Structure 1
Amino acid sequence: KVFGRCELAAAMKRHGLDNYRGYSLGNWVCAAKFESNFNTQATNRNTDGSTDYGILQINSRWWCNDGRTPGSRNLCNIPCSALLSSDITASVNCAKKIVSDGNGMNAWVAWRNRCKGTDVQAWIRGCRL
């Protein structure tokens, strides 16, 4: 599913992301935009052989099982296919683990390069929240 901006904000808020580990809701929407274009089915293969999946481009080396990533962990205890669904639950609950890990939202490179330090409340402006 390709979300609308405010539709995703609302969904993110419903799953408890607004101010999760202190990151305002706009940070999460911004990260989603630039990681996936709001497209739950987004997949991208990396040079190391891991793949990143879903709206929040969660990585196979550490967080989900895809069967083709050697020596990898599955720290979210999910098949990576769970991360492509129109229901964002598994993506959100895995992302809560990731942001907890110690580097905060810096884990999402596109957050660090395109959202960190910017006016991220613009991402939620206009929405009925």
Structure 2
Amino acid sequence: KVFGRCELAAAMKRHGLDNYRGYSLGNWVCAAKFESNFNTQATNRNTDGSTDYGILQINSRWWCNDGRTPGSRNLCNIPCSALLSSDITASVNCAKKIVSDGNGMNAWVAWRNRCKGTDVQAWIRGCRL
């Protein structure tokens, strides 16, 4: 499913991401925009043979099992395929673990390169929230 900006913001807010570990809603919507362009079915393969999945492009090397990343750790206890659903609950639950892991939102390269230190509040402006 391809989210609209305000629709995603509303879903993420509902799932408890606004200000989770001090990251305002705008940071999360910005992250999704640049990781996946708001597409839950987005997948990308990396050089190491791991794959990034869903709206927040969570990586199979640490976070989910996809059955083809030798030595993966499965920390979110989830098939990576669950990260592609139109329901973002699994993605959000996993993301909360990732962000609490010690590097914050820096675990998302597109956040660090394209959202970090920018006016993230622009990603929720105009939304009914």
One fold, TM greater than 0.5? yes
Tell me the residue number matched to 2:101.
101
TM-superposed CA distance for 1:27, in Å, is 0.1
Q: How far apart are the structure 1 equivalents of 2:28 and 2:96?
A: 11
Q: How far apart are the structure 1 equivalents of 2:66 and 2:47?
A: 16
The Cα offsets for residues 98-126 of structure 1, whole Å up to 9 and x where unpaired, read as: 00000000000000000000000000000
TM-superposed CA distance for 1:87, in Å, is 0.1
SS at match of 1:35: helix
TM-score under structure 2 length normalisation: 1.00
TM-superposed CA distance for 1:33, in Å, is 0.1
Q: How far apart are the structure 2 equivalents of 1:71 and 1:41?
A: 24
The Cα offsets for residues 30-79 of structure 1, whole Å up to 9 and x where unpaired, read as: 00000000000000000000000000000000000000000111000000
**Segments of 4+ moved more than 3 angstroms:** none
TM-score under structure 1 length normalisation: 1.00
TM-superposed CA distance for 1:10, in Å, is 0.0
SS at match of 1:52: strand
What is the root-mean-square deviation of aligned Cα atoms in Å?
0.2
> Which ranges of structure 1 fall in alignment gaps of 5 or more residues?
none
Q: How far apart are the structure 2 equivalents of 1:33 and 1:112?
A: 13
TM-superposed CA distance for 1:94, in Å, is 0.1
Report the count of equivalent residues: 129
Q: How far apart are the structure 1 equivalents of 2:116 and 2:81?
A: 28
> Which ranges of structure 2 fall in alignment gaps of 5 or more residues?
none
Tell me the residue number matched to 2:71.
71
